[PDB]
Amino acid sequence: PEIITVTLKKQNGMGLSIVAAKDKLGIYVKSVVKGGAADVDGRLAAGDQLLSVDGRSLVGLSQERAAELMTRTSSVVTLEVAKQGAI
Amino acid sequence: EIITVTLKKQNGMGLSIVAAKDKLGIYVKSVVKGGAADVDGRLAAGDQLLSVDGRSLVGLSQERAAELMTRTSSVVTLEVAKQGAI
């Protein structure tokens, strides 16, 4: 067989696929990544709204702006969550 | 309705692995959609992971390979045999 050398930088994160939707914008969990930190914790689910990150509101901003705020963080991040935010 | 969830971030290459057979071998069962291995585009299901950072992945169980592949730093180097079934 063909033998190649592949170097990967692991994706470090909470294990969450997010989407922004509307009235102000809101950040919702599209999917919880299998085996990721959010999945092992067991509290988060698809459809939940991420209201904030470390005291900073996640309302009225784009997916990219929410991602900038949620990745800027240290190893440990605190989320305020509205269970099934589609209320 | 409103809960407070604190998460500690975690690492991952985005690979589902299996061990199969004179010695055992570590193979890619599935490449996780959107994961690091998927965005890199070189790895595929059926490829054999021959080593992690110079340490051989031959002759060991799935769990032992997982222990070695998760105890590394942010960047990991894999030696790969494309479609490891020769």
């Binding site: 299998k34 085996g35 | 991952g12 290459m13 985005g14 690979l15 589902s16 692995i17 299996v18 069962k29 599935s30 996780v32 799935q62 769990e63 390979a65 997982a66 592949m69 998760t70």
Partner: peptide, 5 residues
Amino acid sequence: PDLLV
């Protein structure tokens, strides 16, 4: 299940 790395 899956064994994820």
